[PDB]
A and B are shown apart, each in its own frame.
With several copies, the nearest count.
Chain A
Amino acid sequence: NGPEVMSKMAGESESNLRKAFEEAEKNAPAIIFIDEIDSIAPKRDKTNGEVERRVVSQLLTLMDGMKARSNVVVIAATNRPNSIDPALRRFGRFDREVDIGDATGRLEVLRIHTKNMKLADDVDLEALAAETHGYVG
């Protein structure tokens, strides 16, 4: 995740990034999920720190340093599509973005969540999935 990369040791964030990247290259052709990238990438213009710039440069030099024998991909989730570094959106690291803009998925999420409770005997979750319109997750 985003803000789970800091440690008391100075520069340990770069060591943690290198450890994760070498583990993903060592084990198998796999996929890395970096959730909440807005904490790691502070857009580099409004920030004023120096270890954030160092960890952004480390993530830049670690995303660029993937060869053909790595065969690993990276996935990253964000909330706002505007507070991202263009150096992270440069050609080489992140170019294929998706724009995730229903009732069946809402019924699936309901049956996933509420199936671990002594619920009822006279419930119809189809009506709860139909009458609920704008809820998510």
Chain B
Amino acid sequence: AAAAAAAAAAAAAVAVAVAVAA
């Protein structure tokens, strides 16, 4: 007989950075 399997690995996120002017 056959069988199934579940899988959830990861994803991709985006970050936010702050800069300084002069």
Contacts and interface: CB of A to CB of B under 8 A. Distances in A.
A49 interface: yes
Interface residues of A, number: 8
B14 to A, nearest CB: 14
Contact of A48 (B1, B2, B3, B11): B11
Contacts, number: 35
Interface string A72-96: 0000000000000000000000000
Contact residue range for chain B? under 10
Provide the main secondary structure of the chain A interface.
loop
Contacts of B4: 8-11, 49, 51
Contacts of A51: 2, 4, 6, 8
Nearest to B3: A10
Interface of A: 8-11, 48-51
